[PDB]
Each structure stands twice: as C-alpha cells, then as structure tokens.
Amino acid sequence: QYKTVKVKAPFPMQPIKVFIYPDRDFKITDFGAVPGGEVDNTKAIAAAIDACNKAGGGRVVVPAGIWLTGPVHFKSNINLCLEEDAVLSFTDNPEDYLPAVMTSWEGLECYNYSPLLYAFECENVAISGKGTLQPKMGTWKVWFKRPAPHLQALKELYTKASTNVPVIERQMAIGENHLRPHLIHFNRCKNVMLDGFKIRESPFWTIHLYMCDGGIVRNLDVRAHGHNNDGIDFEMSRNFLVEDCSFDQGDDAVVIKAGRNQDAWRLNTPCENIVIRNCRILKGHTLLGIGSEISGGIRNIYMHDCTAPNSVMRLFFVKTNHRRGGFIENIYMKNVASGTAQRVLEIDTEVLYQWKDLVPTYEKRITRIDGIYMDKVTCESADAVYELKGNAELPVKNVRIKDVKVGSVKKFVKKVSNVENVVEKNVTYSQK
Ligand SMILES: [Ca+2]
Ligand SMILES: [Ca+2]
C-alpha cells in the first residue's frame, strides 16, 4: 500500500510512491538494547530489524536516551524511527565496521568499511522521527589527513576502476588505507523516505543516495563541519523530491553526481528527475552543485523557492573536467533569494586539483553541456554575477539568465568564454 505525491516541474515527473508502513513497533530494548552510550547495541538493533522484516515490516524504534552502536544494516520494509530526544551514537572503532561491504567512494565502486547506516538492494526503507544521528569523530578526524599509505590506496582504487577490474577485487579496508565510511549510504534501493530527524557531524559523505529509484527527503536539520560533508549527495539516482530541509555545512548544500570517468561509463546510469523546493542553506560554499563527478550523465534537475541568507562562494555551480565525458542537460534554478555571494552562477569545465597529479588521464573525453537556466534570482552583494568557462573543443550551449537583480557588484558583471546561445533577459545591477 502506497500514497503518491505530485510534483510540478518543467519536465515530465511521475508522482512519487510513499510506503504506508504496517502498524507494528519493534522496540530495540525488547532485543537487549541498553542506553547511556557505553553498551554496544549493534546486535540488538540487528535482531529488531530481522524480526520486523520477518513479520512483513513496520517500525524499528529507538526511544529517548543515548544509544551506542556500530553499523546498522537495513532489510526491506523497515522504518528506523528516532523518537524525540533519542540519540544514535556511532562508535569510531574501525573494526566495528568490518567486514567490508559493496559501496562507492568518491565516484568509484569498491568494498570498504560499512557505512554507518547501510541499505543494499532493499525496497521501502526509511529513517524518521525527531531524534538525532550523532557519530563519534575522534578516529575519523585523524583519517582527514592524506599520508603516503592513504594516497597509495586512492591510486590502487582508481587504477582498478579505470581498467575494469571486478568490484570484488577492490578490497579497500586493509592496513592503513583509511577510506572513511559514509553516514547514510543507500545503494540500489527503491522507495526511500527520510523525514524529520537531526544530523550532527559525519565521518565522510553525510547522505549518499546511490543508484536509487523513487523517494522523498524532508524536514531534515543537517549540521556537519568536517571534511567532505555536503548536505545531500545524489549519485546515479532518479525520481526524488527534497523539501523543507535546513543545511549547515563545511562544503555544499545539495549536490548532484554520476561517478568518476570509466567506472561510471561502465555503469551507464544517469542522475535524473530530482526536484528540490523550500530549502535553506545557513552555512556552506554552494547552494546547488553539479559535479565534478558527472560521468554517467546528469539530466532534468529543478531547484525552486529556496534561500541562502548569509554568505556563499557560488550560488549555482556546474563543474567537470577533461577526463569525465558524459553530459549535463536541463538544469533549472528559479525563485531564489541570496545575501552575499562571490558568483551567482559559475560554469567551470576544468576543475581538477587533488586528483591532478596523483593519477594519470586514461582518456580525454569532453563533457557535453546543454541547457542551464536561472530565472528570478536576487542577490544583495556579489563579486560577479556570472562566470562561464567552456572548452573550445566542445562549447557549452543554451544558458539563460533571466529576471536576475544584484544590489551591488564588487568586481565585474560577467565573463564568458566558449559558450554558444547565451541569453540574458532583464538583468539589473549596480556597481562602483
Ligand atoms: Ca580533482
Ligand atoms: Ca579524476
């Protein structure tokens, strides 16, 4: 049984199925869980999940208190309910996250330390309630560094991925490799729901929805200020609505991706049909980011009626580089109010820094960019309105900037290079 939620957009968008869970509650204390943050509740949570799924589904409930746990592995038809004043406290002991599981790390498929909340090929999975996800960060802060053995592991992963070595031979949870695990990583799932809860820090990517089809993300209060902490990362996913969330980030708010180079070309699964509305960025560098990992294709993305009241680097930022191939098509931003920004819109087709020297270019393939649309945007103060840097070998096409007003411009209005069919309509600015 399902409701369906209708979503308006400038492209076709099917209504989104929302599972109605069976009215059954599996309390983790009935399977041996103990609060206070020192008893390890990994096994109790797993036993509650097994019983719920065997019964046909329902809620696995974490009541008020602090509950220490290792990873939580979903099965189908489970809603993990965090009650008000519940805190899931995750351990920072790497051995609790073994054995390794199938995942994707910075756009390359591999086996790594289990994500803290992990779902693989499930249907009808949810996290809900007014409680909090709160990982311990001690060990993971140490793993922010990039010493020699960590660089060796990144090279190993990239070489295997780039030469089509089977994913099971990409075993990364070994020795000092030190690839940090995701907070939420849902992989190849159908009918996802995330509703109501708080996030306080994350070891790696905060909310990773990877190769998923159909879902809703709403009423979230996300705060994470460590390394590689975007608010939400959609990767090779489709048919999602995001609404009514707040983002307070070390990096960007909403980011759309589709993997890195050859490994992604192999998977051939674009990220598409995602709508974001009524959201708010409080801290962070970018409101809507596309890429740099876009290799599988990105198409039909719509953000509207959102705010960024404080200060950002780039409000709308589209990125790729010469290794990526793929395409970026039909990206829309509408009805956004901004405080301060360095750029309102930027397109940069050669963003390559950390991976520039570490590994080689196996193949140059220039990304096709077509249809980037910004309408009804205000910014109080900007260094520049927009800056577009295309590749001469395959220029960017069809960019529209319309009903855009900037209260004060500090450096320059615009700079354009290797872009065709740029349409500016009713742009207003002031400058001195
Ligand atoms: Ca790079
Ligand atoms: Ca690369």
DSSP-assigned letters across all residues of 289-354 = EE-S--TT-EEEEEEEEEEEEEEEEEEEEEE--TT--SEEEEEEEEEEEEEEEEEEEEEES---ST
CA atoms within 13 A on the CB side of 199: 33
Closest C-alpha to 60, from 38, 86, 37: 86
Cα(265) to ligand 2 centroid in Å equals: 13
Which ligand has the minimum distance to the alpha carbon of residue 263?
2
What distance in Å separates the CA atoms of residue 282 and residue 76, rounded to the nearest whole number?
A: 34
- CATH number, domain containing residue 188: 2.160.20.10
Among positive and negative, which fits the CA dihedral 405, 409, 411, 412?
positive
Q: For 381, what's the count of Cα atoms within 13 Å in the CB-facing half-sphere? A: 5
CA dist., res. 432 & res. 430, Å (int): 7
Write the DSSP string, 16-35. Answer: EEEE---S-EEEGGGGT---
Structural element, H or E, at residue 353 = none
**Cα(358) to centroid(ligand 1), Å:** 9
Hey, what are 361's tokens?
């270019």
- Strand-pair category, 108-112 with 65-69: unpaired
Range of the domain at 32: 1-432
- Picking from 27, 74, 83, the residue whose alpha carbon sits closest to that of residue 46 is 74
State the Cα–Cα distance between residues 322 and 264, nearest whole angstrom: 15
Q: How many domains does the chain have?
A: 1
Write out the residues surrounding ion ligand 1, Cβ under 5 A: 352-355
Burial of 148 (0-12, 13-18, 19+ CB in 10 A): exposed
Q: What is the CA(355)–ligand 2 centre distance, in A?
A: 5
CA distances from 7 to 254, 316, 332, 425 (A): 18, 22, 15, 27
Experimental method, per PDB record:
X-ray
CA 326 / ligand 2 centre spacing (Å) = 13
Alpha carbon of 404 to ligand 1 centroid (Å): 31
Q: Which ligand is nearest to the CA of 352?
A: 1
Tell how far the Cα of 158 is from the centroid of ligand 2, in angstroms: 8
The owner of tokens 């990206």 is: 331
Question: What is the C-alpha separation between 13 and 373, in angstroms, rounded?
Answer: 18
| Resolution of the experimental model, in Å, one decimal | 2.0
Rounded (10°) CA dihedral 261, 263, 264, 268 = 130
Which ligand neighbours the alpha carbon of 364 most closely? 2
Distance 284 CA to ligand 1 centre (A): 19
Judged on CB neighbours under 10 Å (0-12, 13-18, 19+), 60 is buried
Pairing state between β 286-290 and 254-257 = parallel
The Cα angle at residue 200 between residues 240 and 338, in degrees rounded to 5: 60
CA atoms within 13 A on the CB side of 380: 9
Burial class (CB in 10 A: 0-12, 13-18, 19+), 413: middle
Displacement of CA 392 from its chain's centroid (Å): 30
* Cis, bond preceding 338 (omega within 30 deg of 0): no
Say whether the peptide bond before residue 99 is cis (omega within 30 degrees of 0).
yes
107 Cα–ligand 1 center, Å: 12
CA–CA gap between residue 224 and residue 205 (Å, rounded): 10
Q: For residue 37, what is the DSSP state?
A: S
Answer whether 244's CB lies under 8 Å from 280's CB: no
State the distance from the centre of ligand 1 to the C-alpha of 120, rounded, in angstroms.
28
Q: How far apart are CA 112 and CA 100, in angstroms?
A: 5
Integer Cα distance of 221 and 420 in angstroms? 40
Q: Are 41 and 69 in contact (CB under 8 A)?
A: yes
Kindly give the distance from the C-alpha atom of residue 97 to the centroid of ligand 2, in angstroms, as a whole number: 27
Contact by Cβ (8 Å): 380, 340:
yes
Q: How far is CA 243 from the centre of its chain?
A: 14
Beta-bridge partners for 127: 80, 194
Q: Around Cβ 432, how many Cβ atoms within 10 Å?
A: 5
Ligand nearest to the CA of 360: 2
Distance from Cα 379 to the centre of ligand 2, integer Å:
33
Rounded to the nearest angstrom, the gap between the alpha carbon of residue 47 and the centroid of all alpha carbons in its chain is 29
Q: What is d(CA 124, CA 129) in angstroms, rounded to the nearest whole number?
A: 16
Query: Ligand 1: distance of its center to the CA of 292 in Å?
Result: 8
Structure tokens at 47: 């036993």
Burial 256-290 (b: 16+ CB within 10 A, else e): bbbbbbbbbbbbebbbbbbbbbebebeebbbbbbb
**Under a CB-based contact definition with an 8 Å cutoff, are residues 337 and 307 in contact?**
yes
